[model samples]
Target: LRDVILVSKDIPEQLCDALFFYTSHNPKDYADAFAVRQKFDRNLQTGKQFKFETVCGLFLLKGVDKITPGVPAKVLKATSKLADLEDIFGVSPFARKYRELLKTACQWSLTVEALDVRAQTLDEIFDPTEILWLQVAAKIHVSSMAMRRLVGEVTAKVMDALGSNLSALFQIFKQQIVRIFQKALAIFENVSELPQRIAALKMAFAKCARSITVVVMERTLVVREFAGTCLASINGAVAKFFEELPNGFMGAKIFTTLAFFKEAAVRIVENIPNAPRGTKGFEVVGNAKGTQVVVRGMRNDLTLLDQKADIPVESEGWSAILGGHLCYVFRSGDRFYAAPLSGNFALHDVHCCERVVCLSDGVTPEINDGLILAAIYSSFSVAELVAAIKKGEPFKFLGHKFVYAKDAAVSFTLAKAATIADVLRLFQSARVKVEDVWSSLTEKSFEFWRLAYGKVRNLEEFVKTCFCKAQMAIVILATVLGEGIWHLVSQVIYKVGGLFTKVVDFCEKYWKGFCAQLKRAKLIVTETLCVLKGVAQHCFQLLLDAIQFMYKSFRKCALGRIHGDLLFWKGGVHKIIQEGDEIW
Candidate 1:
């Protein structure tokens, strides 16, 4: 969700510390006194048009002894050893295996002028004013192994698990594989050079990913399980790997380009084989705008009929109610879906998770694909609730979509608010993540970095790991949605009776359970925070004690001291936008 970067050794150690402090920590702490750029580079745009809606990058330092910082902000999470170049890059089998394939990419960025591999041990150059590396890191990660792996993994998972037999599915996947090569060197030089390369890559991957959805539309159940089982096991490996590390909270880099008009979006909606009806949602209304196209399920804007904005897409066709907001629309046999225009993003550390809940009957459960799918296939679309988000509906809060539950119980408590706040971090306003997004629009991001820890060693491996994690995340998500829809469908069609019974089954079963659970949701959170901390003095207690009182007068004392010794980011947030808008 944030730009987790390895501070470049390209500059003086003092500057490097200052760089780490300013760039990754809270931006407001030093801004009023320190020099800051509000409306940064124009080169990060397609000549002032929102070229790709959003874009992001990550950089790994190759060789370093130790990292120094004023204090790790609560804004950052880290491993006890404070992961550095040696810690992460000393070994990356993926990078070693693909060294040749990765060499060109390394050369593209680390090979900048005055940057040196040997100089890392000996200070050869220092840039008191070298701020461009921020952009360079952003762009370099775009072409890194993660990009290749994430794209490859997502395509393979969708295809092997679900579309192995679909002729058109494989056709599109095959085309992307065969054509991706031709376009590798087809980087676009216009609208800030990177987008062209990014655009071309998007053109190919979008189709590959789009094909999976196409296959899902025709035989969604067949492909849904592919995203489950084997996929769920992978994140479990990483989750524990970190969970064991005291608070091994590994820091990861993530940036995404949310392209509202990602070529793939325009036509995907047309493939819907069937539409959901009486669904409590997804019906037609007169107030809907746009050309009365044949495609009924996927709307690029609000239909007003659903009392919800419904669509997040703002393409040439329809830039509806949330015109500035991004959304991707798709359909499954049982329901219609909307995405927060995700395919153009990248992420690390903060991960995708899976949880399930119910919407219809008191005893039924709804599996949520949004949890896992959102971030993993972010390049395809973000983790999105499988069903349409009711615009004005009181019961369906955006946060409730992330929790795990059974029966028709809903309401995520206020943790509902916390989780939604966390997930929505990706869609914050431009200024929230100003520099991170801009770098994606550059002509040369790798070149922009200008420095490397030393010779590029396993940078691809690091990047690949991030992407692979994301890839694993997608399968886990699809599995949830697949399971959820499969659960809701199996019963109604077989065990239930008339439409009245269906609606009755839906309302009675869902309503009592929802209200019943809403009360419980609030109670659970209150008790947890109230009791969990005294025994778990590990974090919450210390953090609060540090904050409630100040140190100059004593508030900034203990927590700051505790955080300072860790070489870790203490717990805190950025100025002006803590609750939302700090993600890239």
Candidate 2:
């Protein structure tokens, strides 16, 4: 996948061109780079963290976007625009919604600092629990009305087709969703277990979050040069928000302070109801409480297990793998299930995918939820054809298990490697996504495009639209997973049965269906791209070209252009150009 991103040099160009168009287009009098920060800020551990991630994501294009450098930036810019449009035309007026929120948050940060002036303990201003709460609050800070509108728009445009094309429309949407899932699954399958992965992620997130400190904030204001006046205001706001939270971090003080929200988050996590050791995956592995299955797990470090109760070597005789389930499964195919009979365990097969083929040796020891679910859900199987990998390399391959209902099939796949940390390194190392998809969207939707085109008429309206679109994307992403799982199950039944009879009814039936659906999804993306391209071009006249138009003008227009031809002029061109000159 990373190879694909890197090889396709044209994608970055397309993405950046789109981004530039979006930010400069005339609509709102002007747009903001700061506003673009909203879509990305939630992912970072601190304000500094967010700033670095934001700039890195926008400019360098790491990880997945490395393949398609400008994609994350460009798509993100446009999506942000779409979010704004939905807000204005749909819900939430543009008058000071986020600005007011920022003001309050800024005040909160400052109040804590004022208290800190009295020589408070470091922990007082820097409670991880409070940080978590703030993080979630900041993440979903937008209004519900905006969320509803965005979903309505996508559903109406992408999902809801009346009359003869209902099935076809569903298929189109499903395929797109599946393509995304498949990409994720392919990565998960590379890992060894699910528990280890999750555990590793928990620690990593903690480690990353812990790295965030008052010192970090101070340094950021001094070092990154990310605008000290605003940052100081933000620092003050966070400080205040913390101080107001009733007696900062004492005995049971921390507990009391974090009880409700912490418990709630824990409940959400635990409610995932441990992937039935016998099943392969769940719909909401990485999602909060209601999102669909996108992640998978495996790890090399099993150290955290020592702190918890002793999990039997193999529950009911089935082996208990660590670091493979709790954290990183959202990447794709992350479930691994293991069930024990009187003396033996059953596992699922997940090595076979769109492009990856794993060797199946005799009953490999490991298993998890994600692998099983994907098998049960996909349209292929090799249950009996066991160890089709590289001949008699029994230890070289993993285990497999799948289920078959009348029309539904789900499976689990497992691998036999040692430790959670090892698996994590494997998964992380396996991540070849040069075209950082998340970053691509951020840059496209927010930074260049939104600032250029000013697609969002009002901030309130824009935020409203973002809330709607975020929700819609989640739903659309999930619907595809459900349908894809259905097809996956049917395929396994057919493939396993195929070893003996070329005459399996289910296999043939599913193959026919999957092929048809695949074709449909391809067509949907193609058509949708065409439709969206037209809309985008129309929205940003003059700057809409397939390839980026690299001229002396853009160099002059980085901050914005100042020209006599106002008719051909876009807002901010003059500003960006001047900004660029100042920096240069």
Candidate 3:
């Protein structure tokens, strides 16, 4: 059988064909009625097989379909419980009305297709499970009327047929009402469990808040700056959700502080130099030891101690290299220079000359040896000889007394050779520049943060005002009165308070029994009028009765006369004449 079923292209079709082949030869008693019916139905609705299975499994099957026990039944049960609840603690009209609404909702759910849509629509404000509980908890600090209006608005929407889901709605209401009633009754399955749960929930809320804070802090500084500008930008549903959270303000605080820190970190990181590590290139220059020093830059010294004894000097042609008990001649050029080896210090020293010479291989724009040498000696006596040669300070050189003329174009130059200290003072070192950049950036960031702090403080205050119970009351009061009236009321409330003084008594002494006698006379006349009205009504009724009786008597007499005429003459013009005398 398994092999046959597997080989067939359409198993059911083959099964039916096989069954027909076998059943034609077999007796009816051997056939299974239920299996045959199921087979036929499956063949009949091949396309709807899955749907039929799903419906039966979910909606119609006895044990499985009965699992949820239906939303309407639950709602009806809850609504009925409210009566017992009322008996326990008097009736609450709101509770009663809620029950009625639940009953109506139960009916609506059974018949309505839009239940789910409406449930989704209302889920925004009062989802009744998590969201509604939160909303109610937040309003605990507010007036009862506030919560009622909020709940009432949701109820109105449900009643108005603005898309209410029966199952979702009933479930939410049943759960919410039960929870609220439990809260009212101070009922707890485990007394300690509630606080623990509350603590856990609060912790969870805090954790969630922190998670959101992390995300927001991770937000680029651009967004934080933008939020700082439009204070209301961070408000509304999400903000309210956080506000409803327990200990949420602390998370907000952490978020804000972290945001500033992140911003500061970003700013510092942005300012850091990103230059690659490694020498761009190197060159040979003479160290004070008369040996070649390979360095990236002429002044790129990294030694902690000044280890070199003497320094290299540049002059015309052959520059002098003076170092540690020796003087050498070096030839340096713009892109290249030559320095004697460390061992040649003594040989180079013997050949070294005092007069400055420019080396062919030395750096260009070398020192003017003669002029510089001349300026040094001149500086000594220039001030002393100032009176003698005010126009031209004359000084002696090479046995020749000369004067540096005040407008004479001698092309003399005096340059101060700087020591390490002087160089350090003259230009800011990289470290100094780095420090300066940091300080300035810190100040700027602090000021920006200060501005941000002020804005956030104001924003915090604005948010508080938006959520504050007293603030809401003030707003409502203001709204109830028009602007003009509110201004007047505000003025009155702001002003001082007191009581007004009574001025004088206006009444004098009154008269006596004369007024009483007039009152008595009026009272007597009123009673007399009352009696006359009753007497008139009685007389009118009597007159009507007597007239009615006379009419009846006249009718009887006329009928008797007609009867007599019919029995005697049967004349056409016969009339009752003697009854009341005159006939016309």
Candidate 4:
């Protein structure tokens, strides 16, 4: 029995690894193959393999050895089946294992159009689904010194707790991924025992998570960054782990925090000569007893010249302070303490804000404002950012480059001369009625993106719209194809980032859409596999099992391990460059 298999590629020339794969004489043959068809005016016909194995609308071998009796290229192309070439091609085993998932993808491509994702605020980056990760990250304090140390300390805490058990965790998991993906486990609950098994993982991680406390010592932000190269030991092991699971969940674990000791890496001198350092210690009132912190007059010492109060952090006379109570820091080696102090002070009477940067003054958080500037932290060199901030105008992250509204700036203006705070101080000291200054100063209640983009004002909006409106199709696409998440999520993030740039006139908003958007490497989706492969595929059962194993093993945590020195150097989940460290 013979039937023609219609493919849209020149089999021997372009698709197969061996140059002479389609030799016509031997119809039964085997060769490693991959998809690479772009020019297709008609179907390339072949007899179904003398013995058949199949998937992704592909034929295993030369079909009938002559072009005959298969569906025509036109009729097939006329349908939605070929919207993307990679839509349905892979090993027969992969096809079978992920078969149900692929069907969901096919249906989604047919039905959904226009995915509308809500904005991501900083807070929701970790949700309950990830358990205690939020508890660790939620305590993120941004005063540069605090920000720098906390991430490292927390990572060390986790690594030290896991220690040698990490070795077997990786060894057992590495082979498990050679099994293709998971549909086997009842991962998380009911008709879906998978969700039930998944629920097991959630609790498992929480057990591990709860064991590591931010409160045990001190904790801070761990910036979730994407790194391309992984350590050989880690790369191969995790390489499989990422294959089965989703990027959103799995990515959280792969987070290699350069945020540890990254205070130097993230900043470079626009002018280091002018940058503030040292001499900025909290002034404890009485003595070195570290007891009796100032009750009466402490504002000068809190942000001042020090000892006798003669220095400004800027080296000049300018000092900036946030109003309301202060969070003071006291350090003893890496061991430190953070506590909120009451009724702190401000120094508007002096020219504290001589070169005030007016970011925005809106009654509502203009999310676009954050979109404009903060990403520059990623996109620009220090000098370029300093220049851009001073010239504060409209700009955007687009076309894989920075395009600005003008030479200098949007959302930001170099100098506001003096803000309302300074004006109020002037009036108070000058004895003018506060009412007189309040009229001009009262811009009728104000709001900003609240520095951290309202830091997520409400969760419901994110949960409701983000999952239903956007993730449905994205989840399917990334899962079935094992690609497209980075393009899907990142492009999706910046597209709105692009949209907001247009909204306040960052760029002209319009419908030249898709073509105007992607101007990149390797023509879209193939590049997606690269970006997608980087981390997403690594989030598999291999990862979950390790996490699961890790959670269980964590019960052995040596309590109050904080006092011991066995921190960063003792772990096998493999560090992200622990070289200047343990390798020797």
Candidate 5:
């Protein structure tokens, strides 16, 4: 047996740790030993003790002694049957554990390519599935801190080698990370039922996991290509939302308003003048009213000078009557004059231009020619007068000047100066005619006034007279009604103010009753909501109990079947096993 075991043999390195640690030999020695001692099952007992030389080929452990402790049958068996390994070589329990963890870590390496994640913490790097796997590993009988560190380092190294190259992928992964983080830290104190919440959480995480995998597997390209397509789709969706969705329109409007306000705020800040505290620069410089014109009349007290009618004055005189009517007569050489009266009482006559003037006719004869020569000769020489009239220049007469037309000749017969009565006769015809017309017009005006005062002309007749004239009716009606209508409108406004107060009182009385009704309605609504909440709570609790019962039953049945079929003898017909027949 010794010679057969000592012969050269082949062995994988994964079992080297247990072989060396327990049997104090290299993997080659264990291979030879196993082949040489293959004759008996009794030789493979667990807890069997032996002295063996430890191998130096165990890479993780350095500087160990040669003779090692006995190997448990389970550890030895466990080493040989490890499911898979490619480049790795180890067999210590730590090595077995490390290899198991490494398999998952490497698998997780490729999974990282699905997400272009950036993080400073391992917590952020791994998804919920990865976190759950890590938790399972930590629950194993080992130094949890060391296990975590080992797994973290290995996974980080693998991820570094296989980093993603897509920002969109990173964004999608970021959403998942945030969701998971939120859920993991969710407060459960207010949760009414434990089972339902747990089931819902399980369902949510399962769906999330499946969604991630489905999304990743849906495309075969690298994250960069996949992300480009996803982002393109997303951009299209966003544009469509903006065009058709009310919320999107409102959001755009809000952004526009924000931009406007931002610009306005900046302008306001810029335009404000720098000033000292507690002071302001302000001025009232604008016009409050438009331009207008006003006139004022004055009354003067006057005592008329002593006067007698038709008396020639030795000097010029100035006089006034009725304290306001003024008259001034002043001589400038030998002329005597009487001024016109100018006062409010005579304003109408002055405005109408009623004035009198007299011009004398030149028909006088020299004293002796009166009897016979008056008929024989004209009063003046026509030859001399014609010479003066034909001259195209200004020439002076007794107290007047004659102006000739330019480039024109004039021929006239000169006349002698007239007597005063002859001058009166010369103006008598025109003056008498003017006085006759004036007398008739004055008599008719007085008759109309007398009838108007006696009510002989009714308002209808007055209006009819105005309407007979083309332009008078509109003017009269507008003047009479314009100011009066506005005055009536002002009075209406004053009365309407009282109407508003009555309306306010009416509203106040009704609104008080409405408010009391509203208060009652609010109480009823609140109580109804409370009752609904309680009912919902009860239904949810019942639902949770049903779910929990189903889960417990399924779990119990499954575990029982697995143990009955594989773990117990006689198909679990007997529950107990003798000590010697115990599998473990």
Candidate 6:
């Protein structure tokens, strides 16, 4: 039997590194080379002293001859019986790991999509599920760091163990890619089940979710307490704390807020209106003092009006006030039901209105009209108010230039002038009957203010006054003048500014011509100022001329007298002038 086997074979150039790795070569060869050789003596082929070894073991020899270079090509067709490459999916370890990761990614992608969609709505933007998914995905990535390292080692070992078998490696590579895709598909399938997605989630490990929940809940409490304390401590010395608190705690508080908001939204959708009020809703209602429209969940109960009235028990209508100045209330019919154009005021007025109408005229809430207006504000921009009124569900009777047919009955008139002077003129020119009856006693002592208050007259009394509709038209002018005049002032300011800009540009242009003429006439001027193409000189000249004209006009008007006039009286003017010429 050969004691030292000399096994020499041609290896491909790329496989040179693979066949003799110095980094992870068999260390036993260095420790007990002789014993290993003896143990493998039965399998030795060829010469005993000439044995094959990895590059690391070969380095031990002092004067070993270098082998002749072989052709850089694979010599053998490799086959493996250990396991089929495609059987990786069948491996329990790989299949389990892949499925788990895929599940997370699939859920996360969907949550991200939902967040993107709801980002526009202020109310819906802070969805808890999406925020939780973001956090979960982050945790997953962090936990995966070491897991990926292990997976990389396993994959590399399998790949390197396969040697120079191109067909086998290609098959293995294809199998790995297919497994990744399959894992991804499994994730997609589960993520599609969105309705079942929970705001709170669980982890694969025991009590992992419980631990995270406890930690986060505790942290949230601390954040809440700290925030409350900060807000409360807004006294002189500690006042700065309130200002800086937001910067320090806003992000965490925002996260907590998102969770609560999501919970609130879910509660709103789940609970029916008029169900028993929740604690928070009850507290809000209690704090309203005597105000009738206290909010509770999704439903805002109208306690302002009475239980019985001419209003239908159910008019197929839903009324909601939007933006402070705009009132929107409607009733749907088989086609369209005629809704009342009447507006409401305080508690007494509400009771009267309730006595008149069958259904509750949902009270005008002291809500953020900006937000309500924002909801429908787009439909009624400056450009589309008229169109919106006719087609869209919008009517701006409160402060708009256009008058409702209801308001015309009072016969209030105003001026067409754009200024306050014009409004005063119109108010004076018109025959405004002061029939604004606050009560039967105060009736006929009317004006715009009393008519608006409307406690003055009934619908019959108001119509019988028989003020011309032209007076109604005139009233809109004042309303427009009061409200619309500001718009004109801004408009006029902008127009004048535009004209000033144009004048400056024109002067600059003609200024160059003026400068050229001055220069031709040998006027001394700076070349630096003229660096702007002699236009600077022309510009300067135009300014100078403007100043001279302004000064002359100012001087003529400053003393309110013609230049060189001494005698002021009309009768003695000639005699005085002649006498003054002779005197000192």
Q: Which candidate has the highest TM-score of all? A: 1
lDDT of 4 by residue, 1-584 (tens): 34433343333221221111211121110111101111011113433333233332333333223445655542112122212223323233321222232233334223112100101221233222111221111111111111122233334544444334243333343343222122222112133454343333223222332234211000111111101211122234443443432321101121221111101101111212222342211211111111223333222122211111211212112122222223232322111122322123211111111112233332112222222223322332323433454454533222111223332221233222433333222213222222321111111111111211234322112211111112222222223332332222332322232222222221122212211122221111111112222222221222222222223322323321111222111231222443575573
- What lDDT would each prediction earn against the true structure? 0.27, 0.24, 0.25, 0.24, 0.25, 0.24
Candidate 2: which stretches are off by over 4 Å? 1-229, 232-584
List TM-score per model, in order. 0.17, 0.14, 0.17, 0.15, 0.14, 0.16
Best by lDDT: 1
lDDT, candidate 1, 422-464, per-residue tens: 3334223322221221112121222222111122221111211
Model 2 weakest lDDT span, ten residues long: 259-268
Clashing pairs in 5: 14-90, 24-52, 24-53, 24-54
TM-score of 4: 0.15
**Model 5 off-target regions past 4 Å?**
1-176, 185-584
Ranking by TM-score: 1, 3, 6, 4, 2, 5
Kindly report which residue stretches of model 1 are placed more than 4 angstroms away from their true locations once superposed. 1-146, 167-169, 177-192, 195-584
| Candidate 2 local lDDT, 34-110, one digit each (tens) | 22323332322122211222111222121222233544322232123324423322322221233343345434334
Cα-based lDDT at residue 75, candidate 3: 17
Per-residue CA lDDT of candidate 3, range 1-584, in tens? 11101011232321222222211111121013223333433543343212112111211101111224433321111123544433323443333433343444544344223333333444443323322222222111111111222333333322233123122223433344334323422212454454443333222222222112211221111112113222123222223333343321101112211211111111001111222232121111111222332322221111011122233433322222222111124322211122222222211111222111112221111112222212222332322323233343344322223433332322222233422222222222322111211112122322332333233332111111111212222233334333443333343332222100000010011112212222221100111122111122111122223322322322224323222232111122233454465663
lDDT of 5 at 30: 19
Q: Which of candidates 3 and 5 reaches a greater TM-score?
A: 3
Off by over 4 Å in 4: 1-193, 196-584
User: Candidate 6: deviation at residue 414, Å?
Assistant: 14
On lDDT, the stronger of 2 and 5 is 5
